[PDB]
C-alpha cells in the first residue's frame, strides 16, 4: 500500500534560559526512525529504528550537520517573527513544521507537503501544486513574498519529488521486515457497571500494525458511531498500536451488542461480544 516519510520539527525559544530548543523527529509511516534534540549533551542525529543501523557514518554526520544548520535557521525565524508580530523578547514562542512525502505501492509520488505554524496556529503552507504558498496572516504574507522572490517553492518541490521520495524508497527497502509487516489485532471486551441499570462495554484492539484500524459497535446490524466513546489509536511502546471504543448499554441486553474490528491483518473482520 502507500507509505509516507514525515519530519516533525519544533523550535521553542526560552528567554533567559539560553538558546531555543530544537527538535526533529522523523517517521516512515507510523514508526519513529530518527531524531535530533538540541538539548542532548552532544546533539547528533540518532537512529530510532533498528534497521537504520544500515546507514553508514557519513549518513549520521551529514544529517547532524544539516540539523545544526536548520537549528540556526529557526533561531533566526524566532527572532524574525517577534518582529513581524511586534512581540516582546521575554516570552516563549514556538515554530512547528511538518514536511513529508507519500508514495503509492509502486514507489511513485502521491503527494508532498510542508506546513508551518507559529504558537500553534497556521502560519504558511505549500499548496498541493507544490508551486505556491498559502499564508494564514499578514506576517506569513511577508514570508510568502520573500520565498517567492528567492524561488523557495522550486527548491522545496525538488526536495519533495526527488530527495524525499528516493530516501523513502530506500528506508522502505532497508527496513522492509519492520515496515512492511502486518501484526494482527487481538481483541477483547471489558464490562463495567454504572448507575441506573446501565453498563459500559469497552472493546479493546491490541498489538497491531500498521496503526490504521476501525473499531465499531453494532446493534441489530447498525453501527453506533454517534453513541461510541473512544481514544485515538496510540503507540504501545514496542512499535505496535492499540485502541478502544466503548458504548453504554442497558443492563441485561449486553449480548445484543457486537464489536467489529477491521484491519490489514484481519482477512475477515473480528466480531466480539461480552
Amino acid at each position: 500500500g502507500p507509505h509516507s516519510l514525515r519530519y516533525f520539527v519544533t523550535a521553542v525559544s526560552r528567554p533567559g534560559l539560553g538558546e531555543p530548543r530544537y527538535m526533529e523527529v522523523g517517521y516512515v509511516d507510523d514508526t519513529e526512525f530518527v531524531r535530533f534534540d538540541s538539548d542532548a549533551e552532544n546533539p547528533r542525529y540518532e537512529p530510532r529504528a533498528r534497521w537504520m543501523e544500515q546507514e553508514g557514518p557519513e549518513y549520521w554526520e551529514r544529517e547532524t550537520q544539516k540539523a545544526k544548520g536548520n537549528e540556526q535557521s529557526f533561531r533566526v525565524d524566532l527572532r524574525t517573527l517577534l518582529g513581524y508580530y511586534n512581540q516582546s523578547k521575554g516570552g516563549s514562542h514556538t515554530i512547528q513544521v511538518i514536511s513529508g512525502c507519500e508514495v503509492g505501492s509502486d514507489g511513485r509520488l502521491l503527494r508532498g507537503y510542508q506546513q508551518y505554524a507559529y504558537d500553534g496556529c497556521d502560519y504558511i503552507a505549500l499548496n498541493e501544486d507544490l508551486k505556491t504558498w498559502t499564508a494564514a496572516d499578514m506576517a506569513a504574507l511577508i514570508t510568502k513574498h520573500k520565498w517567492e522572490q528567492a524561488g523557495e517553492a522550486e527548491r522545496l518541490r525538488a526536495y519533495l519529488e526527488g530527495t524525499c521520495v528516493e530516501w523513502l524508497r530506500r528506508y522502505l527497502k532497508n527496513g522492509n521486515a519492520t515496515l512492511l509487516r502486518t501484526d494482527s489485532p487481538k481483541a477483547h471486551v471489558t464490562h463495567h457497571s454504572r448507575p441506573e441499570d446501565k453498563v459500559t462495554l469497552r472493546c479493546w484492539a491490541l498489538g497491531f500494525y500498521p496503526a490504521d484500524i476501525t473499531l465499531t459497535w453494532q446493534l441489530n446490524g447498525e453501527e453506533l458511531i454517534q453513541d461510541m466513546e473512544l481514544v485515538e489509536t496510540r503507540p504501545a511502546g514496542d512499535g505496535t498500536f492499540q485502541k478502544w471504543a466503548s458504548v453504554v448499554v442497558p443492563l441485561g441486553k449486553e449480548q445484543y451488542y457486537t464489536c467489529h474490528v477491521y484491519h490489514q491483518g484481519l482477512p475477515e473482520p473480528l466480531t466480539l461480544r461480552w
Binding site: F8, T10, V12, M23, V25, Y27, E32, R48, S92, T94, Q96, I98, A117, D119, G120, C121, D122, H188, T190, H192, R202, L206, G207, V231, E232, R234, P235, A236, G237, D238, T240, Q242, W244
Partner: protein, 99 residues
C-alpha cells in the same frame, strides 16, 4: 493558544502478575510544548522511562509517549504525573488494570 494535555495510561499486554509488560503514558493534545512527565511506581518516580513518538496533530497540538518495561504485581500501583502551564497544579492519572 493553550491546550490542556490528555493523559492516558495503559499497558502493552493485558496485565498478568509476574509477567513482563510495558507501561505507557501517552500525553496528547497539548500546547505549549514545554511539559514535565513522570511515571510513578507506588508513589516513587521510575528511573528508566523512555520518551518517544513525539509528533503533532493537524491542529498543531503535541503528542508524546512515555514508556517503561515493568512486571505487574497485585499490590503495585502505577501512575503518570504531568505538569503543564495549562494546569495550575500537576495532574496524576493512575493505571486502571481493569479498564
Amino acid at each position: 493558544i493553550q491546550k490542556t494535555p490528555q493523559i492516558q495510561v495503559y499497558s502493552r499486554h493485558p496485565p498478568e502478575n509476574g509477567k513482563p509488560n510495558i507501561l505507557n503514558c501517552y500525553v496528547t493534545q497539548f500546547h505549549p510544548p514545554h511539559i514535565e512527565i513522570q511515571m510513578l511506581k507506588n508513589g516513587k518516580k521510575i528511573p528508566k522511562v523512555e520518551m518517544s513518538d513525539m509528533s503533532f496533530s493537524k491542529d498543531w497540538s503535541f503528542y508524546i509517549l512515555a514508556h517503561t518495561e515493568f512486571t505487574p504485581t497485585e499490590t503495585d500501583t502505577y501512575a503518570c504525573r504531568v505538569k503543564h502551564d495549562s494546569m495550575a497544579e500537576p495532574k496524576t492519572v493512575y493505571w486502571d488494570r481493569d479498564m
